[PDB]
Ligand binder design. Structure first.
Ligand SMILES: COc1ccccc1C1=NO[C@@]2(CCC(=O)NC2=O)C1
Ligand SMILES: [Zn+2]
Length: 99
């Protein structure tokens, strides 16, 4: 079961790569609600800019904006600088399509 970019079909992740709960409903400072699925691994993304800790939803992690490497759609964030695990992907579920 493969996760693709909803806009262009870019290969992003797999159900097998979900990181357990795997679903987190969060809000950013602009009040936008994101239903975020955590993945151990993802591909086909472009990480833009430098990591930031500001308003991180996950204690001990910095985020980098993750675009679809193909169409540039915002699919979520790469998280790093934490412990167990050091890195993971928080992807916006409704911006993916499952096979
Ligand atoms: C309007 O947005 C911002 C403006 C300024 C600084 C940060 C943000 C952010 N929006 O969403 C983020 C995504 C990563 C995260 O874990 N938490 C968030 O809240 C970061
Ligand atoms: Zn795309």
């Amino acid at each position: 079961s493969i996760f693709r970019c909803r806009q262009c079909g870019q290969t992003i992740s797999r159900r097998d790569w979900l990181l357990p709960d795997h679903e987190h409903v969060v809000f950013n400072p602009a009040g936008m609600i994101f239903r975020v699925w955590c993945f151990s691994l993802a591909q086909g993304l472009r990480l833009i800019g430098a990591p930031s800790g500001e308003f991180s939803w996950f204690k001990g992690y910095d985020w980098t904006i993750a675009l679809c490497g193909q169409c540039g759609s915002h699919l979520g964030w790469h998280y790093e600088g934490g412990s167990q695990p050091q890195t993971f992907f928080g992807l916006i579920k409704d911006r993916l399509a499952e096979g």
